[PDB]
Structure 1
Amino acid sequence: SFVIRGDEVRQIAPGQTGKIADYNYKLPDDFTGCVIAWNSNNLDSKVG
């Protein structure tokens, strides 16, 4: 389960490279599975 930013989602995929993919979580090339993302705007976002 991740909190990842919106633009970043492209990164959670087998091949990608970027801050999230490099520094935080990396999939193997061989990854077998799905990535289900949905913006949870209401749950975690505040005026501050």
Structure 2
Amino acid sequence: NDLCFTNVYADSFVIRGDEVRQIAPGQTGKIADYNYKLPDDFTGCVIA
């Protein structure tokens, strides 16, 4: 609440619920290998 930001974008989807560990910067499996991938140097928050 004490910072001013640039280029803030959001992302929405629904997953099976056991792959909620695969939305981390550096993971393995067919969601972060075939569907959605985060950069290693991530700055932002995942909310589930």
Q: Same fold (TM over 0.5)?
A: yes
Structure 1 residue runs without a partner (length 5+): 38-48
**TM-score normalised over the length of structure 1:** 0.72
CA RMSD of aligned residues (A): 0.6
* Higher helix fraction (1 or 2): 1
Partner residue of 1:12 out of 23, 29, 48? 23
Structure 2 residue runs without a partner (length 5+): 1-11
Q: Distance in 2 between matches of 1:23 and 1:32?
A: 22
**TM-score normalised over the length of structure 2:** 0.72
May I ask how many residue pairs the two structures share in their alignment?
Answer: 37
